Amino acid sequence: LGQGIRLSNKRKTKEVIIKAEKMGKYKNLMREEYKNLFEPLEKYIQKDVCF
């Protein structure tokens, strides 16, 4: 999986960077289109890649 997603507050004054392997830890935040595209594949993920 490529470079992980980023977070940000409303005004965008703060911006976090996280890897892909930890997106399963913050799934409750990502948008739906990004959510519906990730849960069905969580099974095939091992650490940071997809089997």
């Binding site: 507050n9 409303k10 005004r11 004054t13």
Partner: protein, 50 residues
Amino acid sequence: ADNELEDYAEHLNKTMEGVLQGTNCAREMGKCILTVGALMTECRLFPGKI
């Protein structure tokens, strides 16, 4: 709002106003503001009339 500071001020003010608008003392605040406004605008216009 434009900067983070205003958003923080507006969030804190919203929380406090929500807490403070439900009490009974605030009911008296409204009753005083409105009743005295009306009585002020009557005493100014119609003196000599009870």
